[PDB]
Design a protein around this ligand. Structure first.
Ligand SMILES: [K+]
Ligand SMILES: [K+]
Ligand SMILES: [K+]
Ligand SMILES: [K+]
Ligand SMILES: [K+]
Ligand SMILES: [Mg+2]
Ligand SMILES: [Mg+2]
Ligand SMILES: [Mg+2]
Ligand SMILES: [Mg+2]
Ligand SMILES: [Mg+2]
Ligand SMILES: [Mg+2]
Ligand SMILES: [Mg+2]
Ligand SMILES: [Mg+2]
Ligand SMILES: [Mg+2]
Ligand SMILES: [Mg+2]
Ligand SMILES: [Mg+2]
Ligand SMILES: [Mg+2]
Ligand SMILES: [Mg+2]
Ligand SMILES: [Mg+2]
Ligand SMILES: [Mg+2]
Ligand SMILES: [Mg+2]
Ligand SMILES: [Mg+2]
Ligand SMILES: [Mg+2]
Ligand SMILES: [Mg+2]
Ligand SMILES: [Mg+2]
Ligand SMILES: [Mg+2]
Ligand SMILES: [Mg+2]
Ligand SMILES: [Mg+2]
Ligand SMILES: [Mg+2]
Ligand SMILES: [Mg+2]
Length: 238
RNA sequence: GGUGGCAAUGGCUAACCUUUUAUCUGGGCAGCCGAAGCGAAAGCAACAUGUGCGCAGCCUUUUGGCGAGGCACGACGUAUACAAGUGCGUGGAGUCACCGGGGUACGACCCGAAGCCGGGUGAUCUAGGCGUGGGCAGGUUGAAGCGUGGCGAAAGCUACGUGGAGGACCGUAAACGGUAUUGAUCUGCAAAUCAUUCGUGUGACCUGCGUCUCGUAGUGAAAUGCUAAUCUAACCCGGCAUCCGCUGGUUCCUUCCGAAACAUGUCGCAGCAUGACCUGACUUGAGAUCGUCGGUGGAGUAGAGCACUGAUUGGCGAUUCCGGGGAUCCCUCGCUCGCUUGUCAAACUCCAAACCCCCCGUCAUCCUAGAAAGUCGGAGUCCGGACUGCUGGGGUAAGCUUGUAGUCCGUAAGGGAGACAACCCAGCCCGUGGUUAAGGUCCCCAAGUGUCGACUAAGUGUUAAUACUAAAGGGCGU
RNA sequence: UGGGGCCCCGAAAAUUGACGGGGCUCAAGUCGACCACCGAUACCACGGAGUACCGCAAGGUAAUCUCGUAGGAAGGCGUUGUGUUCGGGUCGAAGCAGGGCUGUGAAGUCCUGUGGACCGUUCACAAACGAAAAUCCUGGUAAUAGUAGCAGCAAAGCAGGGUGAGACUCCCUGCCGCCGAAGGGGCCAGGUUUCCUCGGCAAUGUUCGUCAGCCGAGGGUUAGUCGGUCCUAAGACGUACCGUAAUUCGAGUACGCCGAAAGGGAAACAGGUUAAUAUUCCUGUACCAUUUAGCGUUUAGUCUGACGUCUCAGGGCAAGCCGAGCGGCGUCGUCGCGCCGUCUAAGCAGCGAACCCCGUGGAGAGCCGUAAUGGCGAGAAGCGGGCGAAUCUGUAAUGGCACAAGUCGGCUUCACCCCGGGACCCGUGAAAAGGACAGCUAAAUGUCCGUACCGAGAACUGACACAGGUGCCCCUAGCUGAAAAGGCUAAGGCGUGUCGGAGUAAUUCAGUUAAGGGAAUUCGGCAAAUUAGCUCCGUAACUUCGGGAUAAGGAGUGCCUGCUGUGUAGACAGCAGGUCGCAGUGACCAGGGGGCUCUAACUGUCUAAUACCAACAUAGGAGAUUGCAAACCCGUAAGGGCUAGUACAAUCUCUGAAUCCUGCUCAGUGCAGGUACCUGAAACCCCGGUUCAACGGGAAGAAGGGCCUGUAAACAGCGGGGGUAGACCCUCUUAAGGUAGCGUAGUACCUUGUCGCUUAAUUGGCGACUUGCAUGAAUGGAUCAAUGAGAGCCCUACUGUCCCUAACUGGAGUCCGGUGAAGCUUACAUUCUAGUGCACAGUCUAGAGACCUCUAGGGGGAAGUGAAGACCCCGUGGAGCUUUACUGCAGCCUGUCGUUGGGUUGUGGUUCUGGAUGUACAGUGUAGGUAGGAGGCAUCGAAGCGGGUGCGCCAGCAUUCG
RNA sequence: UCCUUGGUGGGGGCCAAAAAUGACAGAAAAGUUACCCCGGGGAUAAUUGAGUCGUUGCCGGCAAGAGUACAUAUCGACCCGGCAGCUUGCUACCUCGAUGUCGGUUCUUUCCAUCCUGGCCGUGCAGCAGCGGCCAAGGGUGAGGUUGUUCGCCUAUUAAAGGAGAUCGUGAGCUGGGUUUAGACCGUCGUGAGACAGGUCGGUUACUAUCUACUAGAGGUGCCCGAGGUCUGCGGGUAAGCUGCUUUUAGUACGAGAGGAACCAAGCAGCGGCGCCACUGGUGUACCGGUUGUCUGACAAGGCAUCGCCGGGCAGCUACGC
């Protein structure tokens, strides 16, 4: 058994690959709202989220529950966040995407209604509402894909705060090191061609090279799915 | 195999019972082997002796007779199914022991690895992740920002001060690291230390304690590094007395005999099997051939020769033929074929030995105190080496390599060569006396300063074989 | 002239050597012959042993018997026990040491001594039955050897006096030393009695020892306040649930519970006391918590606990320093200096800086602030108030002090306390207990565990009284000085980094110095030397504009006298004059510098114990997958990692900063998509077979494959020969044929390629050329400032690297006292030469030498010692790793069955009503299925007709609306 | 023939024929290891040693001829015969329970096939100087640049700057540049792991001497009236010297000139050897002085910092001196 790969080590769940969950502020999700209900809350603070490197808003709701929300750009302390099917479609409000006009920017979008918000959550990203239909509503993802969602899926109106985070180059291994201390990701990473053959499919050889094509089949088993996985194509576009 | 019991109307019992404490006595016929074979099977199913030779033994007129066992036939059962031949079997000897040998399987004469696998142990070291603490002498540089001021029509450009940034600089024997001396040390202070010299020293920093991640797993800024002095799969115990054709060892005496280092097959080439060769026993019963001489046969090697096959040298004579040289092919001529000359042959032969081989006779030797033959028990051995020949083959040669005959060493003393595995005498029980062998006789050193006839002037030489000994060539040296 | 013998020339090798040596000349050589002798275990003779065969035995025969490895065969000896026979022994068994005799021998027996209770023997039978060997095992014990070590990193002792049997070594005094930002002080983990006292010295202590962490005996640890205990952290554990064949196994969830002697945290101090404990005992003066009783009660949910890195202001203060008084000690050749002390806890009470807040105020052709950033009509300055620190003041003030003084001032202040500001983050820097906000008075209670001592050059760990590590973890006085560097000194700890003496060789470890030369040394400037602090002047190529940079290169520097400036001060900066030395950063400390290349951008990481590199990483660049019930990955499952995450995200790869760029090739392999057609298993279905099945075919046809398309920042590739001043048409092209660049390279075989600079001379370096054996673009190309314990070359400086060594210093060595190992070893051994021999001999052969013992010395030889060669081969020995090797197994893709139901239609017959609808030729009539080969109905029904209801040749059977 | 019996379908068997194992007396079968491990082997290679000598180095015989003529002053074809073992091969006898690699360095020694120095002979030798050969191994044979080199090239001296053997002498002497481990890069090869007889950067050199040998120093015993002194010399050893330059002979002999010697004589030098310390230089931790920092209160006198550092230096030792 030429040793297991880094991906298999991470799947094992060892401490080297686990997130420092105790360092994080909140499991960001929409407040739980019953069918045909609404809740209002006011923003009391804007805090740094170590798990995302983007601000989060602390919201005190009418029901006596205090919750951390994924902050949209422009959300300010003292703002009244409304969440409901009848809520005004305004930045920071959590409304169903069936009530959002075409061309509006949404974020923290539920995969299914009441899911808590799955898509469009990183700093600066946003989704655009494209079409409305009777049972489906379509949005353009930050990836460019068109996603057909239930119109009852809730989303906060606006874009995610923290835009331009990666415009500043790391410039230095130490800065990225400090970012990686709060993440599960292993830093730094050794290239596979630099490893021995017992440690990677690409390892070994008198000189550094994979020895086999780096595009691997989608059928390849664990310990073998390395390099370009099921690549449609390779190279820079001609 | 040796020794016994019983014996075709066979032998022996197993478990078990009888124990009155393992014995023992008496039972115990289940079963096994023998008693019928042949055939895949269905199936079918044989001599209580028909003949001959003949050992022992007995008889005998000493040459014969009878002749168990033995040998050779004949006959029969069955398969080959058609036949014909043949195979196997058939005229009652087995069975159970004791004491041995040997094969096979088991740890299998004893010890000797790396490994493979199971279940467990380990992160007091080290690597990485996390929690919570601690630390970084003293200096240097002087980013943005800010203040005031200069040069400008503006655009803008610019000085100083302030400021205190940076995986910034120097630097500590703080801490961490570990360059070079290839210094000390190298049975050390030390199973990695010491001195000097070095790198980092506000950061991807160093570090305490806590905590987590581990064996086909972990950890790794990746060297197969690290995971408790252990890492290209840790450690403990277990599988395990693993296995090996490979290495080492294997313990008292005498006596008798005494090899093979070879062939064929083998994933065979450091092994094994079968055979040759050694050893033991038995059966059988009259010849055998290591040697000679003569004869009947085989020769195709040596040598020789050119008659075949091919090579090979000139001279001489012809092919009015096939062809090289500058229109009557106007005339010049190489091969080709013969008669003489000169040479050859592993794979040429008109010839043709000496050795040798088969057979017959002969002498010789061995043999009833057991020829030849047969059956069975136990092996070792299949790394060889040498000398003398074979101009052995190959090779420039080789103390090379690979054959062959004889003989040796191996496994061979003693005597002699200076010593000498295998060269000479000699194969050797113990003791004594004698005479020789090889070799030697000036001394070392037993026996010749021996004899005759010559040679050598070079200390040549004083060297059987010899892996241990110099040639071609020359000399009015003698 | 030819043929012969012997000799000569031809004829050169390595330690001194070989006719065996001496030597030998009408021979002691050679040749031809001869004579006598010596000389084996051979041969002969005698005697003896065994063997083979024969013989009833007695014995007979052997010229034709007597070597022997592997090996076969026969007979014996011995050990221990059993059955059995017969014995011996305290008048002395076994065993042991030595000896006599017998036997070929294995062995047996006897004698002497020693020993003190058991031992044999016949015939048989057994076995844990015989040792010289296994780098055999266990024990014991040599040589080495009175040898190495008791030196190197901290060179430490001497005098006098004691104690004692004994004194370098134990005690005291003095002198001389060591550490003095650690070798002192405090304490964690760890140790576990080592602590203290007395008594000892066999061992331990690297010597001694009267000493001791050693030995023996006794003693020693006192808590409401110090810790643990309490809280929670990362993270464990338990129960339950669920999984698992099962569990002591497994993730998650729920509930609990643990997890910090360096995080959070209720509260105590000073002095004294012991031999050893002391915030613990005692004195004095305090404080906290709970329970109870009385006196009163919510403000309730907030705050606190509660937080990063860097930087800075203000205030305080332990330590430190200065002047005066007082009290001691030292010095006293002269002087009047130097040192020590001049004290004082918690608690209690009082004041309160900054920040913040409140009330006034009204500030701009601008004012107010700060070290700095700043602030302001959204209300500055100014003026009042509130809240609120460290610390300070008093009290505790009588305790300790030589009941000696004990009284004052000033300066500074880290490395500690308080307080406030600023900057940075793609990094955001814990939680919970507890506490505060309403408590006051009294009484009672405060259990449990630890507590000695070391905390390391002797108390831990590394086998050690170990130069390592743990821990330099946290602390540290004066001068110099930037300083916690280094040096010299306190306090404190030591002379135990536990052998001494002696002073005399070589050699050696580590240092000092060195004429003249100056890298000639060497692979190479390795090593050493040079420089060195601070101030000022001055500083190049190149550059990413940041730097290079301390570039380079120059000048100054001490002491004394008198001053100037800045500043609140501490101090800092500067000037003038005088002056000494070889030298003023005088010691200590403390860069040598420069030029041209290769390479990697850089800081960083690494082979713990031979590789600190150009390797790894890195930021940057690019590609790939995935919309989250995702991609990727772990698990047998239950369930998980990534993930408290969500495309400017995670994961998977490649390349490796910047700068200029990154060309052509999709034939092969890979990947992706498409699947027209081909291939493609099982099940279902159909056919045949089978009284049933097995079975043989057919149809249908998933994934996969063929096949087509895309894709190179996927793996990869980018070629041969000849006509033309070696370009250009063709080729060979079985995808294409090297673009930009670079080029003899870290790649270039030829090769020390050619030329130029560098040198006297350069297989060198650099530059150019380049026919590139075999360069080339993210298998990244070229290039590059800065950086580098990286690799080469050159210049300068420097030098013992060298010419060529010398002297000197300390430690070893040498010699003496004490202590005291280990490693090689079959034996013998004073060798040397040659030969021989398994061809590399101290031992063999022939010579030559050699009297023995001891000491010192460097290492010629002992093919010296260490290690069953790691190179090579062999083994039907392994291991890891690779793959289009063989064979499998996971994972994954897909068909079928089960889970698995209900409706709607579209596809096959399942099952059958109204008609028997059936008809070459002509029909009166439709075969009314083959037919009793002929024989029934009918006005109570049989037709020629409408689109002709079944149908059909607008005919005619069926009585039908007529 | 198929398990109680009969039958059917389907099986099993007997004899023969076909289908293949070519590694052909028959496994269904790819690599890699320098990260390697274990068992062995001198049964078998790298290295030293032995043998051999094709090859290598050095010669010889006959002399074909060339040499204005003339084989033999000089050169020496064809063929033929050798020596050495210093090149490379061949071989597998020794060694795999290890005989430590290359090159250099240091020190000692040997060979002669002689580079110089000494003596000779020939010449196509006037002299100078050559060319060829003979004897001769006493002495000498050096310094540098490149390269790890050996080898070779080059430089300037030099009388000349010979070659080879000693386990390719010499790692219990040194060094570690090269090769010959583990890391990494480039090129090439391979699908790959990995490889290369390319290149490149980096990469641990163990031991207390038992015996023997040698270098020196002692104690004995032998010899011997007892002792002492002075000698002798069997023997051992030596390189105790070797070699240049200049002057002179002499601008002479010789030679047409140009050029240009030799015997004898002198001095100096290089290297070597032995000794010495008046001189000179070094050292000189005796000693004297100056001075920095600090401590002992100051002065004075002292301690410490490498002898603190700096300057000077007698004796002694020493060479760079004699
Ligand atoms: K890994
Ligand atoms: K990487
Ligand atoms: K013929
Ligand atoms: K204590
Ligand atoms: K780049
Ligand atoms: Mg793999
Ligand atoms: Mg038939
Ligand atoms: Mg400034
Ligand atoms: Mg530094
Ligand atoms: Mg086991
Ligand atoms: Mg055998
Ligand atoms: Mg012949
Ligand atoms: Mg013979
Ligand atoms: Mg043998
Ligand atoms: Mg023999
Ligand atoms: Mg003999
Ligand atoms: Mg034998
Ligand atoms: Mg023994
Ligand atoms: Mg000190
Ligand atoms: Mg002692
Ligand atoms: Mg707890
Ligand atoms: Mg001493
Ligand atoms: Mg680097
Ligand atoms: Mg790299
Ligand atoms: Mg050089
Ligand atoms: Mg490209
Ligand atoms: Mg084999
Ligand atoms: Mg590797
Ligand atoms: Mg091995
Ligand atoms: Mg040596």
């Amino acid at each position: 058994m030429g040793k297991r790969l880094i991906s298999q080590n991470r799947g094992r769940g060892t401490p080297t690959y686990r997130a420092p969950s105790h360092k994080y502020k909140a499991d960001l999700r929409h407040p739980r709202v019953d069918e045909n209900s609404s809740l209002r809350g006011e923003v009391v603070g804007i805090e740094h989220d170590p798990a995302r490197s983007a601000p989060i808003a602390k919201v005190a709701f009418e029901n006596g529950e205090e919750l951390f929300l994924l902050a949209s750009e422009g959300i300010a302390v003292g703002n009244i966040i409304e969440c409901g099917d009848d809520a005004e479609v305004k930045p920071g409000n959590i409304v169903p995407i069936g009530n959002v006009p075409e061309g509006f920017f949404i974020c923290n979008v539920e995969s299914k209604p009441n899911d808590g918000g799955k898509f469009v959550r990183s700093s600066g990203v946003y989704a655009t509402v494209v079409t409305h239909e009777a049972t489906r509503t379509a949005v353009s993802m930050p990836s460019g894909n068109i996603k057909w969602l239930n119109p009852k899926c809730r989303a906060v109106v606006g874009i995610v705060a923290g835009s331009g985070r990666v415009d500043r180059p790391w410039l230095k291994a130490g800065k990225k090191y400090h970012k990686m201390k709060t993440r599960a990701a292993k830093y730094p990473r050794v290239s596979a061609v630099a490893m021995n053959p017992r440690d990677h499919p690409f390892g070994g050889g008198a000189w550094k090279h994979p020895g086999k094509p780096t595009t691997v089949s989608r059928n390849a088993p664990p310990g073998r799915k390395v390099g370009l996985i099921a690549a449609r194509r390779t190279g820079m576009k001609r």
